[PDB]
Each structure stands twice: as structure tokens, then as C-alpha cells.
């Protein structure tokens, strides 16, 4: 397969793949291969995009070196190395955020980056972190040291005290930020309850339940208007909830990818579309009706295009 990583960009319109020979960048909806820059030897385990520009953040095989790659110039322009392993990298026009197993470091997007802030987190081997790219919102959210709590920080007005949200009681397994940067979704390791909070307040906007059996949550994502939300769990299972109606606690739709491989989920071009990128190189598009039933159903192998 060669697939080591897959992740959506900030508008979920594109998704990039880290491969053992290099990286690939795809268009989410419709599916199309935009770029495949092989010959990058090392094995890319994390790719971060800054919308549809030319800069990509790549984490090598050793996971100790963050490399910014200018696809226009076809070369590495910035290289930040770390003594510990890099778990994730988040990008924005003026800041480069690097996720470590114990802390979050914010650098500048200059030729020689300048570490601006250091935030402490709990043990974060998943690399949980979200960063609003919107120009009017430089919000950064990461697991706090309090097991189950989320800490929010405005990267612009850093002097303001952070926001400690007592989200869950166990170890956090997934976090998600809406496109507008105003609402955040949380999930514990039990994976039975999903909670959405306000990033500017810190109150439970809505709590949703996916099932009774404990499952490990993989990916969570809002839509544009933050009215719907899709949650992926084990065996490629995706639940689609409604977020702006307290009269709904369950998911109005639920599907499974044909291969049953775990996947990441995000909404597509059509307002009733949900895209699922599975670990086995599978692409799955799901169209639902207002009641939740399936209408169309597209499946393909994106790594073979």
C-alpha cells in the first residue's frame, strides 16, 4: 500500500498522503490526483497543508525533523529539527505549530523560524492539536495537562488567560475545530459521548451519543455552517449527527466503508455528502437524504490513480 498518513487540509477540499517514497496531494471532491512528489527518501509520516498554496509541512521517517517544502521550487525551504519525536505539525500564514509528545511550540514562518510560545500538554502520542487558519482567528487548541481537559489559546492576544474546558474525564482521543473557528468538538477514549463547546466561552453547546459499546474515535469534522458533524470510529464506521438541535442525541445516519478499514471523515462539495479516506487506500463518498438514508455511493482506490 505504502500509505503512512492521510489528512485533510483546513477547508477539507484537499487531502494529502504521506508515503514511503514521498507524498501525494489529492482533491477531496471530486477525487483527483493533484501532485505526487516521489524521490523524497525517508518516509513521510505527516503532511500538513496551508490551503491550496505551495508550502507543505513534512515530517520525515525519523520523526525528529520538520521540513517545509516549496512545491513550486521543488525543494525544502525550512528545516526545524527536534531532539524528541514530532507527532504533528499545524500551519498558518504567520505561524508554524509543532506538536511534540509533551509540549506545543509555536514558531514563525520565516527562513529561520523564531520560537514564539511554548505550551504544555499531557502525554499526547496521537498529536492532538487544532489551529484555526482564518485570518480573523488565530486560535490554538491542545490537550491540557488535566486528563480530559482542553486548553484554548489565542495565538494573537496571548496575554489573555487560556480557557480550560473540562471536556471529558478520561484521556482525549480526538479534537476538531469548525471552519469558522468558533466551535470545538471533543471525544474521550471511551468514544461513547461527543461534546461540542464554544471556543470563545467554554460551555457545552451540545452533547451527542454514537453508541453504547466503547469504541476508539478516529476523526471528527464539522460542515461549513457547523450544523452537521461526522465522526469516524473503528472498522470504518462513520456516524453523521446534527449539531444545532438539542432534540437530537443520536446520529441520523451511519454507514461503513466497504473494506471496513478505519478512515477519516469530512463533508464534501454537495451539502449532503460525506467523504471517507481509509487507511487501505480506499476513497468512499456517501450521499444521504434528510432522513439519513443512502442515495448515491461512490467507491474508488485513490492510490491507483
Amino acid at each position: 500500500h505504502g500509505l503512512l498518513y492521510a489528512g485533510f487540509n483546513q477547508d477539507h477540499g484537499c487531502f494529502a498522503c504521506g508515503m514511503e517514497n514521498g507524498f501525494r496531494v489529492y482533491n477531496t471532491d471530486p477525487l483527483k490526483e493533484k501532485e505526487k512528489q516521489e524521490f523524497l527518501e525517508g518516509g513521510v509520516g505527516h503532511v500538513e497543508m496551508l490551503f491550496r498554496c505551495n508550502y507543505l509541512a513534512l515530517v520525515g521517517g525519523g520523526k525528529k525533523k520538520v521540513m517545509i517544502w516549496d512545491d513550486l521550487k521543488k525543494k525544502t525551504v525550512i528545516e526545524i529539527e527536534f531532539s524528541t519525536e514530532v507527532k504533528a505539525v499545524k500551519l498558518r500564514r504567520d505561524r508554524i505549530v509543532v506538536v511534540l509528545d509533551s509540549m506545543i511550540k509555536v514558531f514563525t514562518f520565516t527562513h529561520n523560524p523564531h520560537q514564539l510560545h511554548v505550551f504544555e500538554t499531557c502525554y499526547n502520542p496521537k498529536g492532538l492539536c487544532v489551529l484555526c487558519p482564518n485570518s480573523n482567528n488565530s486560535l490554538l487548541a491542545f490537550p491540557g495537562t488535566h486528563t480530559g481537559h482542553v486548553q484554548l489559546v489565542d495565538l494573537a492576544s496571548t496575554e489573555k488567560p487560556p480557557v480550560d474546558i473540562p471536556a471529558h474525564e478520561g484521556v482525549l482521543s480526538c479534537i476538531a475545530l469548525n471552519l469558522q473557528g468558533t466551535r470545538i468538538a471533543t471525544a474521550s477514549e471511551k468514544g461513547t459521548l461527543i461534546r461540542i463547546f464554544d471556543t470563545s466561552s467554554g460551555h457545552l453547546i451540545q452533547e451527542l451519543r454514537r453508541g453504547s459499546q466503547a469504541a476508539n474515535i478516529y476523526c471528527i469534522n464539522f460542515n461549513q455552517d457547523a450544523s452537521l458533524i461526522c465522526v469516524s470510529s473503528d472498522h470504518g464506521t462513520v456516524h453523521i449527527f446534527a449539531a444545532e438541535d438539542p432534540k437530537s442525541k443520536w446520529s441520523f445516519s451511519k454507514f461503513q466503508v466497504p473494506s471496513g478499514s478505519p478512515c477519516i471523515c469530512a463533508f464534501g462539495t454537495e451539502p449532503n455528502a460525506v467523504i471517507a479516506i481509509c487507511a487501505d487506500g480506499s476513497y468512499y463518498k456517501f450521499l444521504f437524504n434528510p432522513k439519513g438514508e443512502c442515495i448515491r455511493d461512490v467507491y474508488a482506490q485513490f492510490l491507483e490513480m
Binding site: 490551503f51 491550496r52 498554496c53 508550502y55 500564514r93 504567520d94 520565516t110
Partner: peptide, 22 residues
């Protein structure tokens, strides 16, 4: 002074193509 500003600006502000992938 212009070159001084450039080397002290974010790389997306200097060399970028926000439609490189679309």
C-alpha cells in the same frame, strides 16, 4: 529597507501561489 522587510516577513507573504493546488 525593502529587502530588510522581506527577510523579516513570513515566507507565504514573500513567495506563494495560493492556487498552486487549485
Amino acid at each position: 529597507a525593502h529587502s530588510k522587510e522581506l527577510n523579516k516577513l513570513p515566507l507565504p507573504s514573500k513567495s506563494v501561489d495560493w492556487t498552486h493546488f487549485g
